[PDB]
Amino acid sequence: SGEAPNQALLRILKETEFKKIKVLGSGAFGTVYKGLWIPEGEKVKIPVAIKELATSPKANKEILDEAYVMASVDNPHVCRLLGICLTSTVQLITQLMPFGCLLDYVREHKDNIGSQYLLNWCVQIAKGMNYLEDRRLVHRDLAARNVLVKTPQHVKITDFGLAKLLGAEEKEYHAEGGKVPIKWMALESILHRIYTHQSDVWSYGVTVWELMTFGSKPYDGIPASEISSILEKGERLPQPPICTIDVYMIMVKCWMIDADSRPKFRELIIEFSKMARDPQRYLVIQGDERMHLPLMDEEDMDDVVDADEYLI
C-alpha cells in the first residue's frame, strides 16, 4: 500500500431530515442557505449551512470532489462535512458559522476588534493549515473570505474547491487552466502554476494582511495582469498602520521568492502564540482595552510556548 486507505464515512441525508430557512449568499460558488437538521429519531436540532449550484454533470463532479476532501478532514480549525443530500442537484451540508466569513466580520466590527482577537485568529488559521499539511492537502484558495466565524473567539477554514491531496512521493501540484485568485497567489504559482504547502504559506501572509488592514483589498486598483510583474520587481503589500515591524516581518517572510525560506505553518503557530501573550507589544490599536466582541513564576518567559501550540 503506497498511500494509506481513506476510511472516512460519507453520510447521506434525507431532504426531509432538514429544513432551509434563508439564503446567506449567491455567486460563483453557487448559493449557500441556512437551515436546521433534525436527525431522524434523535431529539436534537443542528444549525446547518446547505451549499449547492439547474443540474450540470460537470458541476456535480466538482461538488463531489469537495465533499470528498471535507469528509476526510477533522480539526477544530477546519470546516467539516456533516453529510450530502442526493437531490436534483447535490447539496453539501456543513455546520453553520453564525458570525459569517472573517472578511465581512473585520469590515463590520473594524472599531471593536482588539489585538488579542486578531493575533488569536492568526494562531487558529495556522493550526488549521498545519492540519492540512499533516493530511498532505494543499488548500490552493486561502483568503479571509474562506475563513468562517463560529464565535468571535473561534474561526475555521472553509472552501475546499481547489484543494489537492499530494502523494507520499509527490511534492508539487502542477495545475493547468482554471480561474485562480491572483492577488493571494505565490509567485511560483503565477509563473509556473506550481502549488506547495509553502505556496499556501504565501496566501496565509495576504490573509494576515487582510485582517490587519481590517479588510482591505490587496493591491487595490491594480489589474490581475500586473501582479506577476509588480511581485517580480521586489514589491510587496504595505505595512498596515496597526503593525509593528515584528508582525510585518512575519508577513514579509511569507512572501520570500524562495518557497523553502518562508515559515512553515508550525513556526507561524509558535510565533503568533508568543505575540498573543502580550498583544499590545505587537499591535498598536487605538482603544484596545475598551474594544469587546460576543503572569508566570521564574525568569524571562518571553519565549514560553504551551505544548498545545508546539506541534511537529
How many alpha carbons lie under 13 Å from residue 95 in its C-beta half-sphere? 18
141 is catalytic: yes
Residue nearest ligand 6GY by beta-carbon distance: 25
Dihedral pair phi/psi, residue 259, rounded to 5°: -50, -40
Q: According to the binding rule CB under 6 A, does residue 103 interact with ligand 6GY?
A: no
CA pair distance 211, 249, nearest whole angstrom: 16
Q: Which residues contact 285 (CB under 8 A, 6 or more apart)?
A: 113, 114, 115, 242, 291
Q: Quick check: 97 binds ligand 6GY (CB under 6 A)? A: yes
Does the footprint of ligand 6GY cover residue 158 (CB under 6 A)? yes
State the binding string over 227-266 for ligand 6GY (x if CB under 6 A, else -).
Answer: ----------------------------------------
Q: Which of 17, 62, 104, 309 binds ligand 6GY (CB under 6 A)?
A: 104
Alpha-carbon distance 272 to 265, whole Å?
Answer: 11
Is 96 or 211 the residue whose CB approaches ligand 6GY more closely? 96
Which candidate, 31, 142, 170, places its Cα nearest to that of 77? Answer: 142
**Interaction pattern, residues 41-60, with ligand 6GY; x per rule: CB under 6 A:** --------x-----------
Judge contact between 81 and 92, C-beta under 8 A. yes
Choosing from 71, 101, 122, 250, the residue that interacts with ligand 6GY (CB under 6 A) is 101
Distance CA 206, CA 102 (A): 13
Provide, rounded to whole angstroms, the least separation between the CB of residue 32 and ligand 6GY. Answer: 4
Strand, helix or coil at 133? helix
Residues with Cβ within 8 Å of residue 115, at least 6 apart in sequence: 242, 279, 280, 282, 283, 285, 288
Nearer to ligand 6GY, 91 or 158 (CB): 158
Catalytic annotation, pick one of 65, 74, 104, 141: 141
Is residue 24 close enough to count as binding ligand 6GY by CB under 6 A? yes
* Residues that contact ligand 6GY, how many (by CB under 6 A): 18
Please report how close the Cβ of residue 292 comes to ligand 6GY at its closest, in angstroms. 19
The candidate with the shortest Cα–Cα distance to 39, out of 22, 16, 21, is 16
- Residues with a known catalytic role: 141
Binding residues vs ligand 6GY (CB under 6 A) = 24-25, 29, 32, 34, 49, 94, 96-98, 100-101, 104, 145-146, 148, 158-159
